[PDB]
Write a protein that binds this DNA or RNA. Structure first.
Lengths: 64, 202, 52, 79, 64, 51, 158, 80, 104, 47
RNA sequence: UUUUUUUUUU
RNA sequence: AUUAACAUAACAACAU
RNA sequence: UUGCGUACAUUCCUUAAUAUCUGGAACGAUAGAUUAUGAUUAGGUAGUGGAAAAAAAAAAAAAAAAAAA
RNA sequence: UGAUAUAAUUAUCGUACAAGCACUCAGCUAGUUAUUGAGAGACACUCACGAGCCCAAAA
């Protein structure tokens, strides 16, 4: 809760402890099974995730 | 009190060029003025490196015709050096004056913000684009024939044709450029002296 | 908008007090009110003050 | 009255205010009990008066430092 | 996202499974009354469907 | 003074739990010790001539 | 049973007691000094040092300039005026947290103050207006709902 | 690439300052509740013009015409 | 008095009904706090039940020794390495001082 | 204190959230599932 | 039945 | 009827 | 003479602070949506402290919730 | 094909390394407990009442 941990004498009660802040980046990681990419990447995708081709342009056009 | 009047003797290729005289703006730039005057007079002793903080026998590492000429390095004399009386670096000052005159003095800066040192440079022509980036604290009063000769030793690449070094320094014992804005009084709740006193126990 | 099909309903501003005369005033100086099982005062204050 | 809060006296006829000493005589504070009404304003008043911080416990009002006398006399004026 | 000059979207269908009695679905329930209608209008290019399930935790599935 | 008091769940917590714990009584859940089992006391493998 | 004896101190044949003060009624209470001032070092040392030089410097120091007669405007040890305006709205999904700062080195001691004041004043009104619009929006929504229900009943009647 | 290009205009003046600190821009429907004077400008403008308070503030939110950095002499932002 | 609506778009003396709670039929949906179903916060306060009672303060948790290295438990190494293994951790006395005579 | 408990919990969790499960279907969890269903049916009981 | 019970008080 | 360790088989691969 | 290679930016983006003193004794409040130039920060054995989780069992609160059916 | 890299664990001043255990997997297995204790300048949570608090065993 709150923005930060209050260390002031005003806030030293047992009622001020606990809780967790919301975080989008962290929510898609916490409590989620991990999946490896090895032996899973298609031929249509480059190393950096960019689209990849599997046919000459000439052929592509002809069969389009 | 009257402003300081420092002088510099330049030697081009081992030949006595002349003697230039500058006037420092102590009134407006006390700290800045003080720094330069102490370095010129050499009344502070050694430094970090056990070296004397004196401009005597220092080369000019940069001479660009029509733009400016840099110098003041005491450590190496190449450019990658400098040391103020206060230490390594000192905080900047209010940008009051512009760069619209020939012979104006101003401190140098490093990649960082607050990197002011002994390193200064004399402007050869108006430099509007330099406004706000540098602090102006001095003005040439006499000896433009020496600056004219010095300008001849520069190149577009910042090269030097002949050696240029300061022979002798010292202080003489006996119109201003444009302004960026209009200074006005301010409310000073905490006295200045208090800041000093705080650092010693009180 | 000027002439709706019904009388709109809106509560008192939560960022302001309430008249004492109103039955919904949890203030100590509130006027007497004859209530019955099921009567609840403005919870804005009550929830904030769960012990007083 | 001009106060949004009131204080209830003890059966014996005493104000609900006491002291508190903890950590081998190194944390001395005051305790206020039996507080009704608008306590948010009360805390402001207290802090203002005492020139000391105020903590809001679970059914009790603590104030830093010993201000028992001050509190008592303040309360008596209000009635 | 935008593609080909903003004439092509990726997101197609969104299915949301919630419950009408579970406490954990309170947020979803709330959402379904205040922001659902408001959200839908802004994104007419995306189909939204809801599925009621009593004895099952809520979730959401996305189709691209 | 009975029906017009502040709502204090904190107190109720304790009050509620009290009765519940009381109701429990005595539980017979018990586990046996090493010595409570029926067995001997002699060793099984002496240190010499057997790694 | 067991006995719990408390320790006591003796001094000049008198039982030493902690410091205590009486109550002094005041008709009007002046504003306090901002706490933020203490976050610096000049005042911190002043306070931590109990000496005649400190006590003399205190007198000279002008404390009245840092006081602001405006909610939401405060002093910062950074040498600025901080503007605070925090509000939440779950119904409309709107949350605002102003963290505006007015630097002294840019404008001045008084200019910054004034500016900050103005900014907070502005924000107040803005918020007010937004609320007033939300009410009419709600009303409109209600009306549309009612008309849709009537149209639905029409089909059942058909 | 047009050699006859002109310098970009200054920073704009938004009508509402709440959007600067809010988590989302106000919708058109919500913007309808904006009070205006006879001149057509917001009435609120009298209190405060709404000028930039810090260097590189509006640029962070993307209210600027274009993005610029230190290398660009036209730029104005905090530098370490 | 205190019953007008004072709407935007100039001035309008539109009468309104002041109700703390509503069904949304004529305005904004304002459910009562007397229902966990309709609650926005996981941990309500007002609704009284056998399943809602709270301490209003965090409670200390258990800490078992010898449960992972990363755990916030007490020391485990010191107890084993740098310590007397005698089942007493010293003489079976109450006034022991290390050879020297006790205080008394 | 082992991999086995994780498999049992995962299995359990996969069937708990359903209705109309037979005895032959439930398996070892039949008792648990019956208790769950009876517990659930408690809310529908009136005076 | 156990513990506590001001050293101040015009 | 039944998890792992362990045992065998089928399919999948070409900038070689 | 004039040169050049090189280890480490919290410039950019995303997190964290529990032995009374980081602004915060601020703001908000129907129970906190994470501060955009914000200061100090975040290597660690022994020892000490804070916090989040561990699919289960019990409880006589698993239908006042848009649209659709 | 190019570049780069000294299984893990405990003790120890010492990554100590040619020292001690382990082929692999399955099941079991090592800080348990205050009707009797506690805040003691190396760290001590919280509720009620208040110059007053608790009430033991029968019931």
């Amino acid at each position: 809760i709150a923005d930060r941990v209050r260390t002031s004498w005003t806030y030293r009660h047992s009622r001020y402890s606990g809780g967790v802040r919301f975080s989008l980046p962290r929510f898609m990681v916490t409590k989620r099974t991990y999946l490896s990419t090895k032996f899973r990447r298609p031929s249509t995708v480059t190393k950096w995730g960019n689209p990849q081709y599997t046919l000459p342009s000439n052929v592509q056009r002809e069969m389009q | 009190l009257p402003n300081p009047l420092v002088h510099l003797d330049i030697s081009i290729g081992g030949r006595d060029a002349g003697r230039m005289v500058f006037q420092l703006f102590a009134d407006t730039h006390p700290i800045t003025a003080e720094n330069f005057r102490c370095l010129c007079t050499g009344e502070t002793g050694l430094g970090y490196w056990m070296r004397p903080r004196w401009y005597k026998s220092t080369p000019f590492h940069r001479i660009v015709p029509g733009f400016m000429c840099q110098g003041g390095d005491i450590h190496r004399g190449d450019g990658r050096g400098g040391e103020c009386i206060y230490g390594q670096f000192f905080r900047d000052e209010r940008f009051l004056y512009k760069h619209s005159k020939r012979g104006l003095l101003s401190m140098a800066k490093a990649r960082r913000q607050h990197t002011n040192n002994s390193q200064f440079f004399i402007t050869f022509d108006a430099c509007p684009w330099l406004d706000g980036e540098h602090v102006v604290f001095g003005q040439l009063q006499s000896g433009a024939e020496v600056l004219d000769q010095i300008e001849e030793q520069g190149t577009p690449g910042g090269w030097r044709k002949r050696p240029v070094e300061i022979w002798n320094c010292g202080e003489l014992l006996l119109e201003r450029p444009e302004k960026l804005y209009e200074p006005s009084e301010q409310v000073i709740p905490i006295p200045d002296d208090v800041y000093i006193k705080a650092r010693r126990g009180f | 908008p000027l002439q709706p099909s019904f009388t709109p309903s809106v509560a008192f501003p939560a960022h302001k007090p309430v008249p004492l005369n109103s039955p919904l005033s949890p203030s100590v100086h509130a006027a007497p009110q004859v209530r019955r099982p099921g009567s609840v005062v403005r919870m804005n204050e009550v929830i904030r003050h769960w012990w007083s | 009255s001009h106060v949004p809060y009131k204080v209830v006296r003890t059966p014996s006829g005493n104000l609900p205010v006491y002291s508190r000493v903890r950590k081998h005589g190194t944390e001395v504070t005051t305790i206020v009990r039996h507080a009704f009404g608008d306590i948010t304003a009360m805390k402001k008043d207290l802090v203002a008066i005492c020139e000391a911080p105020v903590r809001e416990r679970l059914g009790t009002l603590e104030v830093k430092g010993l201000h028992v006398l001050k509190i008592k006399q303040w309360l008596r004026s209000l009635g | 996202m935008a593609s080909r000059g903003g004439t092509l979207w990726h997101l197609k269908e969104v299915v949301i499974q919630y419950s009408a009695s579970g406490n954990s679905s309170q947020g979803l329930r709330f959402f379904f009354r205040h922001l659902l209608h408001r959200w839908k209008q802004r994104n007419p290019q995306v189909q939204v469907h809801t599925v009621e399930n009593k004895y099952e935790a809520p979730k959401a599935t996305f189709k691209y | 003074d009975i029906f017009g008091l502040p709502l204090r769940p904190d107190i109720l917590y304790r009050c509620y739990w009290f009765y519940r714990r009381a109701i429990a009584g005595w539980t017979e859940r018990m586990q046996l010790f090493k010595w409570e089992w029926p067995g001997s006391k002699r060793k099984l493998r002496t240190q010499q001539r057997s790694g | 049973g067991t006995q719990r004896v408390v320790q006591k101190r003796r001094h000049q044949m008198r039982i030493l007691h902690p410091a205590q003060t009486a109550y002094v009624p005041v008709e009007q209470r002046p504003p306090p000094i901002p706490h933020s001032l203490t976050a610096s070092s000049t005042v911190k040392r002043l306070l931590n040092n109990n000496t005649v030089a400190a006590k003399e410097a205190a007198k000279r120091i002008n404390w009245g300039a840092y006081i602001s007669h405006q909610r939401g405007v405060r002093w910062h040890p950074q040498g600025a005026w901080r503007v605070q305006f925090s509000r939440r709205n779950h119904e409309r999904n709107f949350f605002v947290r102003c963290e505006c700062y007015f630097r002294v080195g840019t404008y001045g001691f008084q200019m910054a103050k004034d500016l900050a004041i103005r900014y907070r004043q502005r924000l107040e009104k803005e918020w007010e207006e937004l609320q007033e619009q939300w009410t009419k929006l709600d009303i409109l929504e209600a009306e549309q709902r009612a008309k849709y229900k009537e149209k639905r009943e029409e089909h059942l009647l058909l | 690439v047009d050699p006859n290009m002109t310098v970009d205009p200054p920073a704009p003046k938004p009508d509402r300052l709440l959007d600067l600190w809010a988590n989302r821009w106000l919708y058109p429907d919500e913007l309808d509740g904006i009070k205006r004077n006879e001149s057509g400008e917001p009435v609120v403008s009298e209190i405060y013009d709404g000028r930039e308070h810090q260097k590189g503030s509006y640029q962070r939110r993307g209210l600027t015409a274009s993005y610029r950095w230190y290398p660009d002499p036209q730029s104005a932002h905090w530098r370490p | 008095n205190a019953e007008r609506g004072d709407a935007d778009g100039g001035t309008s003396a539109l009468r309104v009904t002041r109700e703390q709670f509503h069904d949304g039929s004529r305005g904004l949906f304002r459910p009562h706090p007397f229902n966990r179903r309709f609650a926005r916060v996981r941990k309500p306060v007002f609704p009284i039940e056998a399943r809602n009672l709270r301490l209003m303060y965090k409670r200390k948790s258990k800490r078992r020794r010898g449960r992972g290295d990363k755990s916030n438990a007490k020391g485990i190494r010191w107890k084993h390495v740098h310590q007397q293994a005698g089942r007493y951790k010293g003489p079976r006395s109450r006034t022991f001082e290390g050879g020297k005579l006790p205080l008394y | 204190c082992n991999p086995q408990q994780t498999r049992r919990k995962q299995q359990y969790a996969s069937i708990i959230g359903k209705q109309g499960l037979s005895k032959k279907q439930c398996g070892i969890f039949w008792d648990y599932y019956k208790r769950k269903c009876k517990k659930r049916r408690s809310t529908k009981k009136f005076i």
